[PDB]
Design a protein around this ligand. Structure first.
Ligand SMILES: O=C(O)c1cc(/N=N/c2ccc(S(=O)(=O)Nc3ccccn3)cc2)ccc1O
Ligand SMILES: O=C(O)c1cc(/N=N/c2ccc(S(=O)(=O)Nc3ccccn3)cc2)ccc1O
Ligand SMILES: N[C@@H](CCC(=O)N[C@@H](CS)C(=O)NCC(=O)O)C(=O)O
Ligand SMILES: N[C@@H](CCC(=O)N[C@@H](CS)C(=O)NCC(=O)O)C(=O)O
Lengths: 210, 208
């Protein structure tokens, strides 16, 4: 049996990046699907530390919070930079990704209809920093930080892929980010995973908007 | 060589300053006035257009939690092993989630939402009381038996909530004892009583 178990709703949401990480790294994991019915029952919610999913288990280590899970996997699987300097930069990129993810989630669940236009207008300004980080690292030819993949790469890749669905062509103005997405999307295991029913047949968000 | 660039408020820099002080580290403060910020040049050079900005030698960092993790990693305040490091991260993310709600209240709707906020508070503080009860009965730190960067961040969050809602920790025996115990550490105690800390407002709009 797999030592990894991810407990989540049947959506990609905040679990898309860690699933891409596990798949690309050749790890096995078990998915425990939580239906809205089961969640509204109350018992599972009450046992979750902050009353929220995802919940992750590595052996008998139970974790909550998507970024804690990413950092844990980054640390145990060696996807956290080659030294402390790179680890700090990997963290800085991930926090940036998380900041934009929060705005995206707010749009999707709070005011999709009304704020989608303003959101898409401000997007270039939000994506520029990542284009800049990439240009400073070997000319954007490898990963977001250093010359080895890190957990921040999977998180950034997911953020870019869901924005391409929200605003098709938003990456056209960013040559380095565009090439980065195509390059990472082509990795053997990741490519196989992104094309699988497991990934494709899951909606991005829980309210049907994207 | 540490340098923290920030506005003249405690805000998101309070915890890292408490960390540096308690650990006996020296740092230089570069104050950014609203005037200087509105000039535009500094903002434009900041990676995500925001402060704090931190320098460790020639390593320039942005994002308060990135700075905390960096100091946690280099100063040895990140748990004794990977299992503890993951738990330290889980506590910090929880602190950051409540901090975001606090900041939203303070700057978005202080007058209208303060009552609802204070009513929901016990529910938000319970998880930390529970974490503490599971660690040697709440007698040491939030994770393990050594202090971590999450302790300083949680301490700051609890101290600013006591200012917002005096007595909110009365219902939480472990959190109450935890605050008093950490607040009594020699260097931290000296720092929390200094002009450098005391004479700085908590937030930029005067609300607290
Ligand atoms: O950050 C987040 O991930 C975030 C997520 C939020 N909600 N997620 C949800 C909400 C409802 C469900 S659900 O299981 O009831 N319904 C579903 C499940 C699968 C596909 C479509 N709908 C699944 C996920 C709501 C606010 C947020 O900030
Ligand atoms: O997360 C945050 O830190 C956060 C911070 C925010 N604003 N911070 C500010 C805003 C204005 C200033 S300021 O330099 O113009 N004014 C000041 C400075 C010192 C004391 C009182 N006011 C200083 C900090 C606004 C929204 C946020 O979400
Ligand atoms: N900060 C947490 C947030 C997790 C979160 O928002 N979970 C949502 C779904 S993705 C949830 O559990 N919603 C149910 C609820 O809060 O009632 C993380 O990064 O994992
Ligand atoms: N996620 C960042 C947020 C930083 C932030 O919100 N900075 C605010 C003040 S603390 C800022 O620079 N505001 C000026 C602006 O954005 O115009 C962090 O944790 O440091």
């Amino acid at each position: 049996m797999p030592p990894y178990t991810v407990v989540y709703f049947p959506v990609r949401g905040r679990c898309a990046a860690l699933r891409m990480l596990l798949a690309d790294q050749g790890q096995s994991w078990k998915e425990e699907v939580v239906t809205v019915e089961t969640w509204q029952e109350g018992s599972l919610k009450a046992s979750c530390l902050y009353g929220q999913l995802p919940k992750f288990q590595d052996g008998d280590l139970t974790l909550y919070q998507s970024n804690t899970i990413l950092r844990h996997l980054g640390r145990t699987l060696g996807l956290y930079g080659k030294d402390q300097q790179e680890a700090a930069l990997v963290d800085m990129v991930n926090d940036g990704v998380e900041d934009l993810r929060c705005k995206y989630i707010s749009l999707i669940y709070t005011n999709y209809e009304a704020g989608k236009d303003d959101y898409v207008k401000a997007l270039p300004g939000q994506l520029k920093p990542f284009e800049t980080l990439l240009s400073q690292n070997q000319g954007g030819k490898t990963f977001i930080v250093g010359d080895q993949i890190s957990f921040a790469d999977y998180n950034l890749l997911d953020l870019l892929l869901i924005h391409e669905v929200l605003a098709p062509g938003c990456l056209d103005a960013f040559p380095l980010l565009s090439a980065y997405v195509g390059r990472l999307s082509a990795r053997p295991k990741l490519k196989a995973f992104l094309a699988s029913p497991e990934y494709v047949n899951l909606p991005i968000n829980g309210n049907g908007k994207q």
